[PDB]
Subunit: 311 residues, 5 copies
C-alpha cells in the first residue's frame, strides 16, 4: 500500500479527534497519567471510490491491512499506545473514517511551585511524519474532540479538554512532521491536605511554643525535640509524594521555614536555662515573655510573605 495521490500539489490533510473515556493514575513523582480514549482519523483516498449502485452498499467497511492508513503516533508516551480498531468506513468519494480505542501512559511535566494548591495543563501530542510521495499534515475536527461526563481523575478536578487547532509543522531528520497539541486542564483537590498534613503540622508547632510558658528545661527540651521529630516525619511523608524539583514548592518552603522556628525555639530554651543557672532569671523572663509574642507574630508575617511570593 502507498499514500493517496494528490489531485494538484497539496499536502494530505488527516483530520483528528480524541474523545476521553477514562483518566486515571496521575503519578506526581513520575509526571505521568494513564488515558483510555477514542482516536478518530479522517482522510480522502480517491483510489477507494465506489458506486453504491454496483457494490450494493452505501458505505464500505475495511480491515486496517486492506487499505493505506496514516502512521499516526503520540510524541509523549512511554511505550506505543495499545490500540484496537473499532471501525474503518469508506464513503463513495473515498473519504475514510477511522476509529480506534486506545490506552496509553503519557509523560507530561508538572509545575509543583504552588503544591498542593496547583493546577496543571496535561498534553497529548499527536504526530505524523511526511513520506517521499507526499507531505502529510494534521487537523482538528472539533466535533470529534471531547470527554465522557463520568471521566474522573482521583484527587483532581477536570476543567477542560481542548485542542490547539493549528499544527506545529517542522523539519526533523530531512522530512516534514505535523504535530497537534491536545490539552487536558486539571486542578488539584487540596481538601484532604488540610486535616491530614497542614493542621497536624501546625498543632505540633504550637505545642512546641508551650515551652514559652515553662521554666522546666528538661520538659522544654522534651517539648521542642519531640515535636521537631514529628515535623521531620511530616517532611519525609510529603517528599515521598513528590519528585525532586530544581525550585522550591509552596509546601516545601513552609516545611523548611518551620525548621528555623524549631531551631530558634531550641536557642531560646537553652538561653533561658543558661541565665536561670547563672542566677539571671529576670532577664530570662524578658526573653521568654517576648518569645510568646515574637514566635506567633513572625510565623504569621513569614506565612503572609510566602503566600504573597507564591500566589
Amino acid at each position: 500500500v502507498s499514500p493517496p495521490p494528490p489531485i494538484a500539489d497539496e499536502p494530505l490533510t488527516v483530520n483528528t479527534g480524541i474523545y476521553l473515556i477514562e483518566c486515571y493514575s496521575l503519578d506526581d513523582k513520575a509526571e505521568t497519567f494513564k488515558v483510555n480514549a477514542f482516536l478518530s482519523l479522517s482522510w480522502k483516498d480517491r483510489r477507494l471510490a465506489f458506486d453504491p449502485v454496483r457494490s450494493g452498499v452505501r458505505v464500505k467497511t475495511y480491515e486496517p491491512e486492506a487499505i493505506w492508513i496514516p502512521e499516526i503516533r503520540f510524541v509523549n508516551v512511554e511505550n506505543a499506545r495499545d490500540a484496537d480498531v473499532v471501525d474503518i468506513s469508506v464513503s463513495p468519494d473515498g473519504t475514510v473514517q477511522y476509529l480506534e480505542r486506545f490506552s496509553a501512559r503519557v509523560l507530561s511535566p508538572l509545575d509543583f511551585r504552588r503544591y498542593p494548591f496547583d493546577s496543571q495543563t496535561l498534553h497529548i501530542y499527536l504526530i505524523v511524519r511526511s513520506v517521499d510521495t507526499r507531505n502529510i499534515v494534521l487537523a482538528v475536527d472539533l466535533e470529534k474532540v471531547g470527554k465522557n461526563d463520568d471521566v474522573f481523575l482521583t484527587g483532581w478536578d477536570i476543567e477542560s479538554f481542548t485542542a490547539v487547532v493549528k499544527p506545529a509543522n517542522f523539519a526533523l531528520e530531512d522530512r516534514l512532521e505535523s504535530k497537534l497539541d491536545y490539552q487536558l486542564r486539571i486542578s488539584r483537590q487540596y481538601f484532604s491536605y488540610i486535616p491530614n498534613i497542614i493542621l497536624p503540622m501546625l498543632f505540633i508547632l504550637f505545642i512546641s511554643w508551650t515551652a514559652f510558658w515553662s521554666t522546666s528545661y528538661e520538659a522544654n527540651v522534651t517539648l521542642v525535640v519531640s515535636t521537631l521529630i514529628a515535623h521531620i516525619a511530616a517532611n519525609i511523608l510529603v517528599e515521598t509524594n513528590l519528585p525532586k524539583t530544581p525550585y522550591m514548592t509552596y509546601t516545601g518552603a513552609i516545611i523548611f521555614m518551620i525548621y528555623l522556628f524549631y531551631f530558634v525555639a531550641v536557642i531560646e530554651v537553652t538561653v533561658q536555662h543558661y541565665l536561670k543557672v547563672e542566677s539571671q532569671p529576670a532577664r530570662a523572663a524578658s526573653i521568654t515573655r517576648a518569645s510568646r509574642i515574637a514566635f506567633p507574630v513572625v510565623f504569621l508575617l513569614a506565612n503572609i510573605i510566602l503566600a504573597f511570593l507564591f500566589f
Copy 2:
C-alpha cells in the same frame, strides 16, 4: 463479513450475560478491582439459518473469523480485556450463542465517607457502537448473569451481582451507543480495624488522660507528646491505605478530632504547671479535676454527633 440485515427497520438486539468466576485485588487507592468472568452474547443472524430435519445437525459450531460478531467493549477498563472464545453455537433459526472467558482491571469509583464501615456498588459497563448498516442495542439475559459460589473478594462481603436490564442508549460522535450497567454490591469487613487501629488508637488517647491524675509536669509532657506521636503514626498508616478525597471520611473525622483532644490536653498540662509555679495549685486542682470528667464526656458526645452525621 457484514452485520445481519434487518427484516423490517429494527435494531439488532445483542443479549448479554456476565458470569463471575474470580474477583480479586480491590485496590482502594487506585479505585480498581480485577475480574475473571464469562461473557455471553446472543443475537439472530438469518444468513446463518439452516433446516433442522434436512441437516440432521441441531447446532452448528463456527470459528470467530468465519462469522460476524458484534464489537462489544467495556467502558470502565484500564486496558482492553484479555479474552479467549470458548464456544460459538448457531441454532436452526440462526440464533447465535457466543461465549468467551475474559479477565479485566475495572475502574470503579468508591465512596469512602463511611470507611471502614462502608458499602460499595462496583460497575462493569458493557457497550456497543452502531454500524452504518444498522443500529445495535444491548439486552440482559438474566439466565446468564451470575457468580460462582466460591467468588471471594479478600476483605469484603459480596452481596449481589445484578444488571440494570434497560440499556442507556445515546449518541456519541454521530453514531448510536448502547450501554449496560452490571452492578456488584459489596460491603467491607470492618472486623480487623477494631483490634488493629480503633482500639490501639483509643488506648493511647486514654493513656494521655492519665496526665489528669498527675502533678508531675515533666511526666505529663512525656505522656501527652509520646501518645500524640503514636497517634500521628496511626494517622499516617490509615492515610496510606486510602486515596485523597475532596470530603471527610468517618475515620478521617475521628482521627482529626483526636488531635484537638491532644492539643487541649497540652494546654491543660501547661496551665496546670503555670499555676503551680505561680503558687496557685488550688486552682490548678479545679481545672485538673474538671478535665477528668470533661475530656471523656466531650469525647463521647463528639463521637455520638460524628456517628449521627455519618450514619
Copy 3:
C-alpha cells in the same frame, strides 16, 4: 476440527496430569502463588487411528492446529496460563498424548487463624466444558501427577501434591462442566518469627514490667510509654505482611492482648504515683508488689488459654 465421535453414547474422558517444575511467590496479602509445570492430556480420537505395518511408524506426531484438542482451562487463575506445547503423540488406536509446559498465577484462599504456625492446602482447579456434540469429562492419571525434587517455596515446606481423582461434574450456562481439584499441601516455616518478632516483642513487654520495681513515676512513664510505642511498631510490621481477616489470627490475638497489659501497667504506674503524692505509699507498695506476681502470672495463663483456643 470437531470433537471425537462417540462409539455408543459415552462421554469423552480426558485424562490429566500436572507435574510441578517450579513453585514461587506465595503472596500472603494477595492469597496467590506462581506455578511453572507440565500439563499432560490424554484422550481417544478414532479418526486419527492407523495400522503400524502399512505406515511403518509405531507413533505419529501432529501440530496442535492439525488435530482436535480439548479446551482445558484453570478456574482459579488471574489471567489465562502461558502455555507452550512440548509434544503431541498418537498411538495406533488413536490414543492422543498431549504435553504442554505452562506458567500461571493461581488464586487460592489462605486460613491465617494459626499464623505463623499455619498449614495450607493450595488448589489448582482444572476444568473442561461440554460441547453440543458430546459431554467431556476429566480424569486423573496418577502416574503423571508429581513434582520435581528441587521444588522449593521460600518460607514454606512442601508436604504433598495430589489430585482428588473424582471430578466435580455440574451445569454452568446450560452446559455441563467437569472440574478436577489438584492439591498442594504446605506448612509455614515459623522459625524466623521467633528471633525477629516473638522474642523482641516479649523482651520489650518484660522491660515495661521493671516499672514494678521502681518508685520513680517519670522513669515508669518512660518505661511503659516507650515500650508501648515499640509494640505499636511490631503490630504495624506484622499487619503489613498479612491481609485483613474477618477473624482473629493467633499472632493478632497475642498482639491485641499485649495492649491490655500495657494499658493496665499505665493504670498501675498512675495509681502508684497518685497514692505516693497522697501520702499513702504503704498501700501503693501493696499494689506494686502484687503487680510483680499478677502481671507475669496473668500473662502466662492468658497465653495458655489462647494457645488452647487456637491449637
Copy 4:
C-alpha cells in the same frame, strides 16, 4: 519437519553454550536474577549436507521455520525466555550452528547463613526432552561459554561463569530428559554494610553502656530504652532486605544477641536503682563497676564464638 535420523542407534548430541551480555536485578527476597545472553546450539543434520566444491558456497543460511531445531528450555525460569534468533548456519557435512539472544528471570536459591559476607552459586539449568523418533542429549562447547568483560551485578563481584560438562540424564513422564548446569559464582560486596548498618548498630549499643557510669535512673532508662528502639529500627531495616529463612543468618544472630545485652542492661539499671532506694549504694556500686568490664568482655567473646560458628 522431523528430527535428524540416527545412522546407527546413537542419541542426537546438541552442543550448547551461554555467553552472558548482561546480569542485573539480583533480588535477595525473591531469590531471582535477570540475565541477557547468547544461547548457542549445534547438532548434525545429514539431510542438510551439501558439496562445497560444486556449490561454491562454504555455508548456507536458513530461517528457523525452514529446518528442524531442538526444543531447548530452561528449568529454573519464571516464564519462558524472550528469544530472538541471530543466525542459523549449516556447514557442508550438515553441522548446524544456531545462535539466539535471550533474556530471562532465573529462580536460584541463595544461602544467607553468612550474610552480608556471603558467596553464591547461581544456576541456569538447560534442558531437552527426547522425542519419540530419537533420544536427545546435551553437551557443553566450552569455546562458546563465557561473559562480556563489562558484565556487572550491582552489589556483587562476579567470580566465574562455568558449565558442568556432564549432563544429568533422567526419565521424566516416560521420556528421557538431558539437563545441563551453568554456574555463575558471585560474592557479595559487604563494604557498605559496615558504615550503614554494622558501625551505627555498635555505636548505639556502646551509648547504652554509658549508663554504667551514671547513677541517674531516669537518664539510664532514657539511654537504654531509646537505643533499644533504634536497635529495633535497624532489625526491621535488615529483615526487609532479606527473605524469611528456616535458619539463623550471621547478621540475624548478632542482631538477636544484641537484644539480650539490652535486656540485661535494663536489669542492671533496675537493680542499681532498687539498691540505691534501699540504702545499699555500696553494693549497687560493685554491680555497676563489674558491668563496665563484663558487658564489653562478654560482647567480644560472644562475637568471637559467633564468627567461629559461622566462618
Copy 5:
C-alpha cells in the same frame, strides 16, 4: 534474503543515528533509564539499484520483509527494544534509508562518589554481528544524531547527546562484531537535597551541641539521643534512594562522620556528669567550655578535608 555482496572485499558499512524523543525514569538503585527515540540506518545494497528515467520514480519504498535489513541490537538493554518501522526508502544507486521509532530500558552504571553533586555519562551501545558471507561495520551519521528540545529527565540537567564516531570492532564467538557508543551526559539537580536533607541534618546536629551549654545530664541525654535517632532516620532515608556501593559516597561519608560527633558528644555528656557527681565541676567546666569550640571547629575542618578528597 541475503546480505549485499562486496564489490571488492570491503566490509558493509551501516551508518547509524539516534534521535531522542523522550528520556524518563532514571532509577539510581537499578542504574537504568528509559528512552524513546528514532533509530536511523543507512547502507548500500546494489541489487536494489534502479534507473530513475525507466522506473518513473526518484525513490522506492519497501516493507521490511521485502528487503535485507541489518540485525542491529543494543548491548546494554534489559529486554529487546520495542520497535516500529516508520520508513524504508531506496535511492537510484541502492542507498537504503531505514527509520524506526523505539523504546528501551537501558542498563548504564552510575558513579555515586560525589552524590548528590554528581554528573553521569549514560551509554547506549549499538551493535552488529557479521555474517559468514560478509563483515558488517557501524558508522555514525552526525546529521542524524540529536534530541528534541523538550527532552527532560526529572531531577537531572541534560548536557549533551553525542556519539563516539569510531566503533569498537572485536571478535565474539569467531565472528566480527562492531559496537558504537552513544553518550548522554547529565548532571544531577542537587537543589532539593539542601532544604530536605542537608540543612535538616545540620540543624539536628547543632541542636545536639546545645548540651555544651547545659549542666542537666537528663536534658543532655535527651538532646543527644533524640537528635541521634533523627540522624538514623535521615541515614535510612538517604540509603533507600541509593544502591549499595563498594566505595564511600560524599553524602555517605558526611552521614557516617556525623555518627562519630554524636558518639563523642555522648562521651562528653557522660564525663561531665561523672565529674559533677565526683565533686569535680571545675574540671567538667573546662571540658564543656573546650567542647563548645572543639565540636564546631573539628566539624568544619573535617568537612573541608572531605570536600577536598571528593571534589
